[PDB]
Structure formats: C-alpha cells, structure tokens
Amino acid sequence: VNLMDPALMTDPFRGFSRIREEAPIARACFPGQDTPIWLVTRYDDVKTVLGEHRFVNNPASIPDDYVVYLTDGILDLDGDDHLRLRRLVSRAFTARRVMEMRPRVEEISGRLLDALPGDRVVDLVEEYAYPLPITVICELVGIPESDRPLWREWGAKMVSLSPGAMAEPVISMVDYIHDLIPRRRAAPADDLLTGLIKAHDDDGDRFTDTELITMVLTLVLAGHETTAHLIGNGTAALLTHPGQLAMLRARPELMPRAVHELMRWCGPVQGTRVRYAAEDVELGGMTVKRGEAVMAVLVSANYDPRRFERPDRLDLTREEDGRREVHVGFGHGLHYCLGAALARQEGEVAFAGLLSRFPKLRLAVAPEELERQLMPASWRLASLPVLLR
Ligand code: HEM
Numbered sequence: 001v002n003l004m005d006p007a008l009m010t011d012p013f014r015g016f017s018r019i020r021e022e023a024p025i026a027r028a029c030f031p032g033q034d035t036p037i038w039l040v041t042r043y044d045d046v047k048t049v050l051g052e053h054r055f056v057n058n059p060a061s062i063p064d065d066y067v068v069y070l071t072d073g074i075l076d077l078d079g080d081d082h083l084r085l086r087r088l089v090s091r092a093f094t095a096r097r098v099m100e101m102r103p104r105v106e107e108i109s110g111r112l113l114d115a116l117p118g119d120r121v122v123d124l125v126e127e128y129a130y131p132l133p134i135t136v137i138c139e140l141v142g143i144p145e146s147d148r149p150l151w152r153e154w155g156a157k158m159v160s161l162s163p164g165a166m167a168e169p170v171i172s173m174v175d176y177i178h179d180l181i182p183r184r185r186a187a188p189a190d191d192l193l194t195g196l197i198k199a200h201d202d203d204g205d206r207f208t209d210t211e212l213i214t215m216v217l218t219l220v221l222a223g224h225e226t227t228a229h230l231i232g233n234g235t236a237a238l239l240t241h242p243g244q245l246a247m248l249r250a251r252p253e254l255m256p257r258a259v260h261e262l263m264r265w266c267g268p269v270q271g272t273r274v275r276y277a278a279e280d281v282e283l284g285g286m287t288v289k290r291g292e293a294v295m296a297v298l299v300s301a302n303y304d305p306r307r308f309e310r311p312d313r314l315d316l317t318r319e320e321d322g323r324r325e326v327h328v329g330f331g332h333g334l335h336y337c338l339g340a341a342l343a344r345q346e347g348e349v350a351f352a353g354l355l356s357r358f359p360k361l362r363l364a365v366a367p368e369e370l371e372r373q374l375m376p377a378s379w380r381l382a383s384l385p386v387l388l389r
C-alpha cells in the first residue's frame with residue numbers, strides 16, 4: 001500500500017507526514033522485497049523501533065580480499081559483537097578529543113572560508129561543505145597533512161564517480177589505512193588513530209588490524225557526506241529565512257540550539273537502515289513478525305506535531321537548552337550516531353564562520369531553483385550558489 005519512489009522523493013516532508021497522520025504503521029513496497037517492510041513514522045514509534053533489542057541490523061542475527069572492510073562495520077553488527085566494538089571505540093573517541101577538536105575545526109574552516117572569492121558566485125557545497133568534514137576527520141584521525149589533498153580527492157571521487165567505479169577510491173583508502181596503522185603504532189602521537197591502536201578493555205580485549213581499518217573507513221564514510229549536507233542544508237535554510245538568520249547573528253549564543261533546529265528541520269539523514277525482527281514484536285497495536293523488516297522514518301518523526309508544535313516552522317529558539325536533543329536526526333538507541341558531538345561542533349563552527357566573515361552572505365538563485373540531489377532516505381543539495389560580498 002506504500003510505494004517508495006514517485007513524488008515522495010521530491011517532498012518527503014509532506015509525503016511522509018501525510019502517511020504519519022493516516023497510516024502510522026504502513027506497508028512499504030520495494031522491488032526485490034525479500035520480506036514485508038513496515039514503515040514507521042510517528043516520533044514515539046520511531047524511538048520504540050530504534051531502541052528495541054529485538055530488531056537487528058543484519059538478517060544473519062570490490063575484490064574478495066576487501067569485502068570485510070565494507071561488511072563488518074559497527075553499523076552492520078548487533079548484540080555482543082556490537083557491544084564490543086562500541087565499548088572499544090568509546091575508549092578512543094572521547095569527550096576530551098571532541099573538545100580538543102574545536103579550535104582545530106575553527107582553523108580548518110577558517111582557512112577554507114578565507115580562500116573563497118568575493119568576485120564571483122561560489123558553490124558552497126563543492127567549495128566548502130564537502131572539503132571541510134573530510135579534512136576534519138583527517139585531523140581527528142591524524143592523517144598526515146601532506147596526504148590530506150589525496151584524501152579530499154578520494155572523497156570527491158566517492159561522490160562523483162559512477163557506481164561501477166566508486167570502489168576504486170574505497171580500496172585505495174583501505175590500502176592507505178592498512179599502511180598507516182603500523183606506522184602510527186611505531187610512532188604514536190595524540191590522535192584518534194593512536195587512540196584506536198592503543199585502546200584496550202580492562203581484560204585485554206582490543207581491536208584487530210582488520211577492525212582498525214574497518215573503523216577508520218567507517219568514520220570517513222559515516223561522517224563526510226552527512227556532515228557536508230548538514231552544512232549545505234542548514235546554510236540554505238538560514239539564507240532563505242531572513243528573520244531567523246538575523247536573530248542568530250544578533251544572539252550568537254543561540255548557535256547550539258540553532259544547530260538542533262537545523263538538524264530537525266533539514267538534517268540530511270531522513271531514514272535509517274532497515275531493521276529485522278529477530279522475534280515477533282508488538283508495535284503500536286500490531287505485531288511485526290519474526291523475519292519481517294521495519295524502516296524508521298526520521299523526517300516524519302522530526303515533523304511530528306505530537307512532539308513539536310507547528311513543526312513546519314523553522315524556529316531556531318524552539319528548544320530552550322542546547323544540551324537537550326529532542327530530534328532523531330542522529331538516530332536513537334544502540335546505534336545512535338557515534339560522531340554526533342563532532343558533527344554538531346562542525347555545524348556550529350561552520351555556521352558561525354560563515355556568518356562572522358560574510359555579513360552580505362546571500363543566496364544567488366531563488367530557492368525554488370536549487371537542485372536537490374534526489375536519493376533514498378537523504379535530503380541533499382547538488383550545489384549551493386551564493387554571493388559572499
Ligand atoms: C561527524 C562525523 C560523523 C561520524 C564520525 C559519524 C559516525 C557514525 C557511526 C560510526 C555510526 C554507527 C554507530 C553504531 O552503529 O553504533 C553512525 C550512525 C549514525 N549517524 Fe553518524 N557520524 C557522523 C555524522 C553524522 C551526521 C551529520 C548525521 C546526520 C545528519 C549522522 C547521522 C547518523 C545516524 C542517523 C546514525 C544511525 C543510523 C542507524 O541507526 O541506522 N551522522 N554515525
């Protein structure tokens with residue numbers, strides 16, 4: 001009764017909100033459906049689904065030599081295997097590291113912004129939103145500065161090559177990380193790669209080299225395009241909302257709350273990967289059967305009027321306390337985004353940077369003319385043309 005392609009893609013906000021209201025647990029129909037898929041759209045039900053341990057991400061619960069790096073990543077694991085990797089990665093990817101990243105993200109962002117020209121239209125997606133978060137992950141991980149252009153190029157190729165060729169930069173990145181790990185282990189420094197290498201549980205358990213390569217690749221893949229589109233989408237939102245933008249410039253302490261609202265209103269991830277029922281589960285007055293799939297819809301949860309009053313309004317002041325996170329744009333439960341604090345920091349830094357350097361920052365086309373890169377479960381611009389001066 002629900003089919004995923006037609007004009008849902010163009011307006012997922014109205015499309016999934018109508019569904020939320022009329023059919024809060026609905027069947028979704030996709031070609032090659034190896035099971036029934038249940039679409040879950042209410043805020044409370046999306047949190048129920050994402051917090052439920054009976055839902056698993058792997059139904060079990062590129063050369064052949066590279067396959068592991070793409071299949072055993074943290075988001076693909078459940079139960080005890082997940083518990084272990086999450087515990088291990090949390091010993092290295094710490095609060096201290098995130099706090100210490102702030103001035104580094106400020107310097108990186110500033111150097112990018114400072115090189116942008118005033119004498120032509122600037123594409124903020126290609127020229128800033130994409131290079132920043134890959135560079136930030138380079139800095140976090142400790143990729144040698146000399147090789148950051150190479151990493152940005154691999155990142156750019158991952159987004160722009162055909163799907164028959166997208167493997168090449170992935171494999172090259174793997175090879176790079178494989179080579180770098182023993183170097184960093186022989187020459188340790190205060191960076192996240194060292195942190196990962198040296199992390200160990202109190203009983204001695206620790207990452208294998210395979211797991212270290214997989215984890216590094218995961219952070220890049222999970223953190224590059226997502227963060228890019230938070231920056232692009234949030235900037236476009238601000239530049240089309242002059243009253244909210246003026247408030248934000250007048251009250252820059254609003255930035256953390258402003259980022260929460262931009263995530264709720266136009267965050268780039270609109271659905272999570274499919275969950276599978278490990279056993280029968282009662283959910284909002286029905287029963288999901290063992291083996292059936294469930295797709296949590298973040299965008300409809302984040303626009304749910306049961307939770308957010310006038311949810312269609314972009315209100316940067318909506319949440320009073322920048323410490324509270326009410327939206328599900330970073331997910332929920334055991335797979336809640338590992339990078340959320342870093343991503344929110346990149347957003348705060350990016351939006352503050354843009355506003356501070358460019359009082360005359362403005363869109364260079366009417367918003368109806370922006371091109372969305374249509375893509376399942378995503379909300380992303382193809383480009384963001386602006387004038388800086
Ligand atoms: C800053 C860099 C980022 C890194 C390093 C990062 C890393 C990750 C990782 C490793 C996971 C999987 C964790 C697990 O399975 O236990 C994850 C999940 C997730 N992240 Fe991120 N992330 C980043 C940015 C973002 C951004 C900007 C968004 C959204 C706009 C986002 C949304 C998500 C969501 C929704 C999940 C959960 C997926 C699910 O349950 O299916 N992340 N993140």
Ligand SMILES: [Ca+2]
Binds near residue numbers: 225226375378379380
């Ligand atoms: Ca995407």
